[PDB]
Symmetry: none
Subunit: 316 residues, 2 copies
């Protein structure tokens, strides 16, 4: 299951992966002291306010499912400090941020009640991200924070490997679309995370079923899912269908077994925070994502395909 | 507490610090024989009248809180002499004098009833001064006086040091005002005690809250009070507010916690006799005194700031 400590306490998250908006000026409450069960104070900002944050760089896209926090007792004075509530803010690139929401509004996490006890919060909806910010909203005596993050990698699941949109392994020539906003479009614009724009059809406010992004994997693969992202009025896909082809001639949609019709996948709720959509493994060389509904600003999309190698050999 | 003998009996007040308007012509009743419990006569003037005085130079600004007197018995004749009542007159410079008052009128201190006993008078209101004159009003047989003075230094209190208006440590460039009566004004005019004039705004009969004197301490300091003085129709401030700034950008007034509004400090009742106004210690580099009420002759002011060094380090 996806609830493994990501490496604050263990040290797997190295000191340099931990930063903050600021730190207490005497240098005794650095971001690097924010490790859960740490024995030397904790992180404390320059000023106590709701505009400060602790930031963890997880290096690569990671599933985040839970957060645990403590306050800290001062080694110098024995005074206890703890955060009573915080907001969560995430990013795939460090520039584009999403404040975690519960329905319409920002989720306010209830945190500590003392300086020693661990308080764990499970996300009601797990989160694909790289950068994590904890932003204290209320505190006792002052802000002090020790932290653990919980989750897993996408590739922890079997046959899940990112097939090469993000990494560039899938070349520009292998990425194509029904139409593009600009002509002499660069196919790299459609790459999950690494792109700084996105694929936009000629009129992003387009017609359902008419537009598509196609990935040619170059050889047949076992395809088990996609990761969809919006684009940099924010543009993202809200609903989509997926079709696939082994031979480049015949296509099929992934079916909703319950409805006996092409499956309508849920898209994104934000332009940056991506969403994983898995499905029953299918042999395919070509995959198309067909946007059906989108945000008010129209279709904008970055994408990655998930799977592994295919075997045309099935035993008899 | 501020009731320590200032050095008449101990000899801390040296002979040269003691003088009088005159002395008995045979030289056997000199001002230097006016020390409490002295064993050789006492001070006696050339003529017995209410126009004579004994004068003590305390050298620097000193808190005076009590006076003790005796008469004296003649070593030569065994006749006893004592002062029955006296007035008190004080000065910061030896030129400008204030007769101590009780309400509207001069305070007449009741003194001795015999030649041997000590009679102590506590001032109903303690007094910041340098020069002290005892002026006998009534006497038995004749004027003879032995004396002790009681009080303390301002710097006996913690974090109280005069920050450099009086001494010149605070340079002319660090002293400024909202407006001045004369242009090409010398900032040194505003220095507590050492100035022989004072700060006057363009129209000393001015509008409340409109005028101010500013001291720039050159670095942030812990500020714990001011000493205000009038100027040389006598000009002095009667009521004032104090504002302060750490960063030279943001200002705050010292608040009256009872009223939740800027504190209205009591000013002077005389042009020369200064008054100490302490407050809760605050970090500041810049301090402004804003006159709100003043004597009929308008705003006139000399000033000193009180405090000590600041530490931007507060332990956590």
């Amino acid at each position: 299951q996806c609830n493994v400590p990501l490496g604050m306490e263990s040290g797997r998250i190295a000191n340099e992966q931990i930063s903050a908006s600021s730190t207490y000026s005497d240098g005794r409450w650095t971001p690097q002291q924010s490790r859960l069960h740490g024995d030397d104070n904790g992180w404390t900002p320059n000023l106590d306010s709701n505009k400060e944050y602790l930031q963890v760089d997880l290096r690569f896209l990671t599933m985040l499912t839970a957060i645990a926090t403590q306050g800290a007792i001062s080694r110098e004075t024995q005074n206890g400090y703890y955060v009573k509530s915080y907001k969560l803010e995430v990013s795939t690139n460090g520039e584009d941020w999403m404040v975690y929401r519960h329905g319409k509004n920002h989720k306010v996490f209830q945190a500590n009640n003392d300086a020693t006890e661990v308080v764990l919060n499970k996300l009601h909806a797990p989160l694909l991200t790289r950068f994590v910010r904890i932003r204290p909203q209320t505190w006792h005596s002052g802000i002090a924070l020790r932290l653990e993050l919980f989750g897993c990698r996408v590739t922890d699941a079997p046959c899940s490997n990112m097939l090469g949109m993000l990494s560039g392994l899938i070349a520009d020539s292998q990425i194509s679309a029904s139409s593009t906003q600009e002509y002499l479009w660069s196919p790299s614009a459609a790459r999950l995370v690494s792109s700084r724009s996105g694929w936009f059809p000629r009129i992003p406010q387009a017609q359902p079923g008419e537009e598509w992004l196609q990935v040619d994997l170059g050889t047949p693969k076992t395809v088990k899912g996609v990761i969809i992202q919006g684009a940099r009025a924010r543009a993202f896909v809200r609903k989509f269908k997926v079709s696939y082809s082994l031979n480049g001639k015949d296509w099929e949609y992934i079916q909703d077994p319950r409805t006996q019709q092409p499956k309508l996948f849920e898209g994104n709720m934000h332009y940056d925070t991506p969403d994983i959509r898995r499905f029953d493994p299918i042999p395919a060389q070509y995959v198309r994502v067909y946007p059906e509904r989108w945000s008010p600003a129209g279709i904008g999309m970055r994408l990655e395909v998930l799977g592994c190698d295919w075997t045309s050999i099935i035993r008899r």
